Amino acid sequence: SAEYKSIAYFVNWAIYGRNHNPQDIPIDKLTHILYAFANVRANGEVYLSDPWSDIDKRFPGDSWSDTGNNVYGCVKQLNLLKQKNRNLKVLLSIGGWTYSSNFVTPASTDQGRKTFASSAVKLLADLGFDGLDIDWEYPANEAQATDMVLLLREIREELDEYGREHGNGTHFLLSIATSAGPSKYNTLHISSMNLYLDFWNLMAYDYAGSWDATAGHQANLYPLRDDPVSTPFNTDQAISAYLTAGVPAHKLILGMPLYGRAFTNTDGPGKPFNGVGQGSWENGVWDYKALPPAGASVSELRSIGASYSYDAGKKTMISYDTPAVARQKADYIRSKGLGGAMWWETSGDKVGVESLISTVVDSLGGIGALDKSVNHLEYPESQYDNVKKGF
């Protein structure tokens, strides 16, 4: 029994335009939820970025008192989900590509790192999280790379102390979202960081996009040696780099996109393009559940683990993963002995048989092939009465 992890991001702004609530999270196919994002002040304080979504919004069934003794919002809903599904772990993701977090300043001093670690663990202790997920994008030089190691070490120490004194000896989790681009991961001190991390979520997507001159595949497993300009990056090169630096394969989680990246005015992969067109929530990016577009043909490149839609009349290509590609990446996960799968983000997936999450879980071996470690339910230090009592 292999015990692969099935990890997905739930973004706290999904409750608005995306109309995607924690009750819609496919928890029957997931082992970990990454709740995104908390923000980081320059003094190191980690704090909730959206008090309404996070703790204040009243879902159906919630009380409407406001004496401030209890938590609501998505946090309460996630705690309810942890009660129903005892192998569902919920981590607080800190940072992200939000322009709302300063990692460089706090991580560079001992005081900043202790303020980060203590405020994040207090959030975990108050809100009922199973761990923390650090999303610093990205350490840009050697000084920041060492500061990343020292920050992870400080967080690990404070999580361990919290677990000893208030977690009945529970090992709370510490993970990271990490880059697949060589210029970025070669800057990291990978083996040093690995001492303090439970797993690495490899952001194996966004390989191609609006910043390019030629259209390309955004999440391919392997380089296209027949035409390398169409594959500016490839996952296998990154996996080998982390493996070589000393990360065990089972600690590498393969991130996968629940969205497509579009290129307009193009003949196809490796050809010039002009613009990215429209999108679901930003130009040039389409939810997977909005794909493929009507009238476009889908091409499957089994050689490199990639697929794309192409409308010849509109000269539009969209790089996204079909179920066939998801199965290839699931085969890649098992063949390489990787730790499992990660997705960004839950609101983009299809429902039913075309769900990429369900497709990957099937190819991994089904429910029996998933991690069965139990989550943590007791949070006796929480300021919130319903968290302390357990809902």
Cβ-based neighbour number of residue 308 at 10 Å: 30
Q: Which residues pair with 340 in a beta bridge?
A: 5, 253
- Count, residues in the chain: 391
Dist CA 208 CA 185 (whole Å): 17
Query: β-pairing, 297-301 with 306-311?
Result: antiparallel
Token pair recorded at residue 187: 């800057």
Q: Write the burial class of residue 335 (CB in 10 Å: 0-12 exposed, 13-18 middle, 19+ buried).
A: exposed
Dist CA 114 CA 93 (whole Å): 18
Which residue type does 215 have? A
| Residues 245, 246, 252, 255, Cα dihedral to 10° | -10
Residue written as token pair 């880059």: 179
Angle between helices 110-127 and 142-166 (to 10 degrees): 40
Dist CA 151 CA 98 (whole Å): 20
Cβ atoms of 256 and 342 within 8 Å: the answer is: yes
What is the chain's Cα-based Rg?
21
Cβ atoms of 130 and 171 within 8 Å: the answer is: no
Cβ atoms of 193 and 152 within 8 Å: the answer is: yes
Dist CA 196 CA 180 (whole Å): 20
Active-site residues, by number, are 137
Q: Write the burial class of residue 239 (CB in 10 Å: 0-12 exposed, 13-18 middle, 19+ buried).
A: buried
Query: β-pairing, 252-257 with 259-263?
Result: unpaired
Dist CA 6 CA 254 (whole Å): 10
